[PDB]
């Protein structure tokens, strides 16, 4: 888990996807796919940050001021995580978007819980987004 | 029409709007101090990157030319839906550099009715020049326009 | 009409109202005085401009690209106004305030037409708020 508060983006091959969701763990949920358990398990999941976004946004005020916390990306990680054969801007950077994220906020504008997670399953789902990704993920895998 | 134009507009301000990010800014003085074996994939990023801004200006531009198209033609297929000109306008004076929007106003925003831009006069007249003037120019579409609506609608 | 965009509130005495509410204001609105016919005229404004976010904001938009449209604070407009015996980063601010306001976002909070109705009454009808105001601008007139 070193890689956090999207700091994949800002690899050289930046991250499409909020997170993996590839035809092996759509298919392995059964017959119904994303639909059904995992949409509704989803919204509530969503529903339950939402109602404790004040905890959670004042948690991660304390690990970004923390100052051993090293989670700003560097060229050194991210060349070592793709290799082939001020501090105080990006935090506040992160933690807007972090509330964003926590009242719904996408493109600046207000979605509703299961319409952002409509939104954050067709992400994942896109075969343009994976197709964009690093071999080395296996995005077909 | 008018779906089309807002879906394509929405599209590109999404787009101008990640090129103005905050995100954006970090990656590039990311990119520039890496810059600063080690060569190769100093090279390839800056390859790697430039093509990357290369496609997504490509889209950018397709996606702002299929909006100013689909706006002229709204516009022109009814007056429900006429204060979308400042839309149309406000596309046109942020991206006259463009060859391909002022072609598209040239031929087509001249046959829409001239009363549609009375109350962006101002703003239409404030954007006057001859720096820039030609076959294709903006400042020369721009005083066209200008004075076909003087000449219908005088007063 | 030459003061707008919250261009007071630049202004050395700062302007805490957002409009005129005073208690004459009040008085000639009859017995019931804010409540009733005003706060749900206020609450039907408030959702016609809301419906009409995007054509308010591109109008904006419009008005603050225009090169003779000196609607920017000043020195000597400022100290003309209250007399005693990057352009793009503004207007960027200005664009994204208003879209706030248009979206019902006040303190970083989504507060409903109702709810951004009673706060703004209750701004403009604060009498700590009229207190520092400035005394040519007569608040308790």
Redesign the interface.
């Given at each position: 888990l070193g890689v956090a508060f999207?700091q994949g983006?800002?690899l050289?091959t930046?991250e499409t996807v909020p997170f993996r969701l590839t035809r092996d763990i759509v298919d392995g949920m059964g017959i119904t796919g994303v639909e059904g358990v995992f949409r509704r398990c989803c919204e509530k999941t969503m529903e339950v940050m939402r109602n404790s976004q004040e905890t959670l946004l004042t948690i991660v005020e304390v690990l970004l001021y923390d100052p051993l916390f090293d989670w700003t990306?560097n060229?050194l990680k991210?060349?070592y995580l793709a290799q082939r054969p001020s501090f105080n801007?990006?935090a506040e950077?992160v933690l807007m978007r972090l509330?964003e994220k926590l009242?719904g906020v996408e493109?600046?504008t207000?979605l509703s819980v299961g319409g952002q997670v409509n939104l954050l399953i067709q992400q994942a789902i896109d075969p343009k987004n994976l197709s964009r990704l690093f071999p080395g993920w296996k995005a077909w895998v | 029409f008018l779906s089309l134009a807002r879906f394509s507009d929405t599209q590109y301000q999404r787009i101008e709007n990640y090129m103005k990010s905050s995100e954006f800014e970090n990656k590039q003085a990311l990119l520039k101090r890496a810059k600063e074996r080690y060569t190769v994939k100093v090279q390839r990023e800056l390859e790697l990157d430039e093509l990357a801004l290369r496609a997504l200006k490509e889209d950018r531009k397709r996606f702002l030319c299929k909006a100013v198209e689909n706006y002229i033609n709204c516009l022109l297929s009814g007056e429900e839906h006429d204060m979308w000109v400042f839309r149309l306008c406000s596309l046109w004076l942020e991206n006259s550099g463009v060859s391909e929007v002022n072609g598209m106003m040239k031929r087509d925003g001249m046959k829409i009715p001239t009363y549609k831009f009375l109350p962006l006069m101002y703003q239409l007249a404030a954007r006057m020049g001859t720096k820039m003037m030609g076959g294709l120019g903006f400042h020369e579409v721009l005083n066209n326009l200008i004075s076909r609506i003087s000449m219908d609608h005088p007063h």
């Open positions: 999207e983006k800002i050289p930046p990306m060229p991210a060349l801007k990006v950077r509330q009242k493109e600046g207000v | -």
